[PDB]
Amino acid sequence: KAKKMIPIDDDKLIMEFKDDATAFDGTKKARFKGKGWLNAQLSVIFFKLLEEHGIKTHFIGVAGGNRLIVEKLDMYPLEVVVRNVVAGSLKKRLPLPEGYELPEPIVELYYKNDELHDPMINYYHAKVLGISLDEIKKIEEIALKVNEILKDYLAKKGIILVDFKLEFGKDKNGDIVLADEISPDTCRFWDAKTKRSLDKDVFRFDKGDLIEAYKEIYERITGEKPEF
Amino acid sequence: KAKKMIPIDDDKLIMEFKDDATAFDGTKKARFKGKGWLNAQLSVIFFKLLEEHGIKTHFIGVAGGNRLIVEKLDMYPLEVVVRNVVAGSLKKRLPLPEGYELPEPIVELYYKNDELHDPMINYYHAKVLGISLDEIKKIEEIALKVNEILKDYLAKKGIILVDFKLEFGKDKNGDIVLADEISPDTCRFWDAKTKRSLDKDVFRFDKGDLIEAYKEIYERITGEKPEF
Ligand SMILES: Nc1ccn([C@@H]2O[C@H](COP(=O)(O)O)[C@@H](O)[C@H]2O)c(=O)n1
Ligand SMILES: Nc1ccn([C@@H]2O[C@H](COP(=O)(O)O)[C@@H](O)[C@H]2O)c(=O)n1
């Protein structure tokens, strides 16, 4: 959809961010010039923040342009979703309005499977998929810690971390390592004052110009205007 | 759909089993003469078996015909599903065939909510709904024990307990008590030899005559032909 993966060797690979955007199970599609760059840069900033906080990520370095060098891992077939504020699919699962502030974070597990359109699963389904209760517990522990770090950091910049999606794999030591990306593609970010979307929802629901929203996040996070 | 509830006082009520059957979010409907009687009788047999095994149920007694006297409870808004063999909706959640024998039982939680069409939930959604992790753990512990007792009992009668749904509430002591019904409406039952459905799937998928299938379960469980 929005990224490619180039092998280097056993230890590492390239993760390239493309300008393509898709939504609604890729039934909606557009290209946004500079999106790749924005999403690459923001992933790096977030990975570096998490690393300083003692979160193990796959981030190794940058390879110019929209390319990151990342650790190769045995990927878990999961999308791990952490939610602070009601939005998106949660409205179809709990009878609560968009914008409802949750009493505590919700963690949701989704089975990465295109044939089944990524259905939500629980710990028992995960076990049948070969993922132990210990592993699931470690995964959710990390996700919730990531949540705390990102939401605090972003709030001190005028942004509500509404929800976000993470992916994980295992390294050669058997350690659980945070993978994939962290960007306005994979998070919901709302302005603290106006509650307006500064993320992929701008594209999903035609709420304005996506590049404009993604630049605004970047500027608010870095304090600099996007170079490209 | 298939049952009514008549108040008696604070302590108890009547649960009446009707001949109505519905499926596919009540878009399919029929009436089966004697179904109420069968489902009433079988619920009683199962509740009595579980009670002997130290499971707390709402079963108090029989009130003639298709009526049970049951303890009044503060109902949890849950449908608790235990699965031993792949069937039904599980095929849309895990890429496994109908009839796959699971390595261990799966427990699934569904939020009872007609507006949302009973969506599956996890422990975090349950907490937002006011159900503590301790309560959810006690509920699943009971469900899995119920599974062991029923599947053993039924296997010693030539029936595979494929999956089933339970409901629970709290009594005045704050204890978690098994409620609603246990019947061929709320379980999948397969013949051990032929793998054929002796349950509501006969109605769901026009696999034969429902009353015939429900009688066969009853006869195999009791050793007697249904009196009515
Ligand atoms: N495949 C997916 C599914 C959800 N997500 C993200 O997870 C969060 C939850 O999305 P839903 O409300 O669609 O479940 C959103 O921030 C969304 O962008 C994602 O980045 N990739
Ligand atoms: N509302 C519901 C949903 C499921 N069930 C039962 O739970 C089991 C799982 O059903 P699904 O495969 O439809 O999830 C089946 O035995 C079905 O009869 C029920 O008795 N009432």
Query: Which experimental method was this entry solved with?
Result: X-ray
Beta strands in A94-158 (DSSP E): 101-111, 120-121
Structural element, H or E, at residue A202: helix A201-204
Token readout for A195 is 């509650």
Q: How far apart are CA B29 and CA B204, in angstroms?
A: 10
What residues pair up with A165 in beta bridges, in sequence order?
Answer: A81
Instruction: Determine if residue B26 is left, alpha or beta; phi over 0 gives left, psi from -120 to 50 gives alpha, anything else beta.
Output: left
Q: How far apart are CA A122 and CA A107, in angstroms?
A: 10
Q: How far apart are CA B33 and CA A165, in angstroms?
A: 51
State the angle between helix axes of B133-155 and B35-52 in degrees (0 to 180), rounded to the nearest 10. 110
Contacts of A109 (CB under 8 A, 6+ apart): A78, A79, A80, A81, A120, A121, A122, A123, A126, A136, B122
Token readout for A11 is 């230890």
Cα dihedral B39/B42/B44/B46 (nearest 10): -130
Between vectors from CA B30 to CA B29 and to CA B34, what angle results, nearest 5°? 140
CA of B157 to the centre of ligand 2 (A): 22
Token readout for B7 is 């108040």
Q: How far apart are CA B25 and CA B119, in angstroms?
A: 12
Pairing of β A12-17 and β A67-71: antiparallel
Domain ranges of chain B: 1-73+210-228, 74-209
Shortest CA distance to B32 belongs to which of B40, B43, B21? Answer: B21
Of all residues in chain A, the one with the smallest CA distance to B130 is A103
Q: How far apart are CA B153 and CA B156, in angstroms?
A: 5
Q: How far apart are CA A181 and CA A195, in angstroms?
A: 24
Measured in whole angstroms, how far is the alpha carbon of residue A8 from the centre of its chain?
24
B87 CA closest ligand 2 atom index: 12
Q: Do B93 and A119 touch (CB under 8 A)?
A: yes
Shortest CA distance to A104 belongs to which of A84, A123, A128? Answer: A84
CA of B161 to the centre of ligand 2 (A): 13
Q: How far apart are CA B7 and CA A108, in angstroms?
A: 39
> HEC string of A156-192?
CCCEEEEEEEECEEECCCCCEEECCCCCCCCEEEEEC
CB A164 within 8 A of CB A81: yes
Contacts of A87 (CB under 8 A, 6+ apart): A98, A99, A162, A163, A188, A201
Q: Is A3 in the pocket of ligand 1 (CB under 6 A)?
A: no
DSSP label of A54: T
The CB density around residue B191, as the number of other CB atoms within 10 Å, is 16
Does A74-209 match A1-73+210-228 at the fold level? no
Matching CATH number, B1-73+210-228, of 3.40.50.300, 1.10.40.50, 3.40.50.2300, 3.30.200.20: 3.30.200.20
The CATH architecture annotation of domain B74-209 reads 2-Layer Sandwich (3.30)
Indicate the residue of A92, A106, A120 with minimum beta-carbon distance to B128: A106
Pairing of β A20-23 and β A28-31: antiparallel
Q: How far apart are CA B42 and CA B214, in angstroms?
A: 10
| Closest-CA distance of chain B to residue A17, Å | 30
Q: How far apart are CA B186 and CA B163, in angstroms?
A: 9
Q: How far apart are CA A214 and CA A44, in angstroms?
A: 15
A199 CA closest ligand 1 atom index: 18
List the end-to-end C-alpha distance of chain A, in Å, as a whole number. Answer: 21
List the end-to-end C-alpha distance of chain B, in Å, as a whole number. Answer: 21
CB A145 within 8 A of CB A137: no
Sign of CA pseudo-dihedral B26, B31, B32, B38: positive
> HEC string of chain B?
CCEEEEECCCCEEEEEECCEEEECCCCEEEECCCHHHHHHHHHHHHHHHHHHCCCCECEEEECCCCEEEEECCEECCEEEEEEEECCHHHHHCCCCCCCCEEEEEEEEEEECCHHHCCCEECHHHHHHCCCCHHHHHHHHHHHHHHHHHHHHHHHCCCEEEEEEEECEEECCCCCEEECCCCCCCCEEEEECCCCCECCCHHHHCCCCCHHHHHHHHHHHHHCCCCCC
Indicate the residue of A93, A116, A127 with minimum beta-carbon distance to B92: A116
The CB density around residue A162, as the number of other CB atoms within 10 Å, is 24
CB A93 within 8 A of CB A106: no
Q: Do B128 and A95 touch (CB under 8 A)?
A: no
Q: How far apart are CA A77 and CA A139, in angstroms?
A: 12
- The residue assigned the tokens 């699934």 is B108
- The residue assigned the tokens 């971390």 is A161
Q: How far apart are CA B21 and CA B1, in angstroms?
A: 7
Q: How far apart are CA B217 and CA B34, in angstroms?
A: 14
Pairing of β B20-23 and β B28-31: antiparallel
Q: Is A163 in the pocket of ligand 1 (CB under 6 A)?
A: yes
CB B221 within 8 A of CB B210: no
- The residue assigned the tokens 């149920």 is B57
- Contact list in A for residue B127 (CB cut-off 8 A) is 103-104
Q: How far apart are CA B105 and CA B83, in angstroms?
A: 6
A132 touches chain B (CB under 8 A): no
CB A215 within 8 A of CB A77: no
Shortest CA distance to A148 belongs to which of A107, A111, A186? Answer: A107
Buried-state track A173-200, b at ≥16 Cβ within 10 A, e below 16 = eeebbbbbbbbbbbbbbbbeeeeebbbb
The CB density around residue B25, as the number of other CB atoms within 10 Å, is 9
Shortest CA distance to B154 belongs to which of B105, B102, B225, B221? Answer: B221
Token readout for A203 is 């594209």
Quoted resolution (Å): 2.0
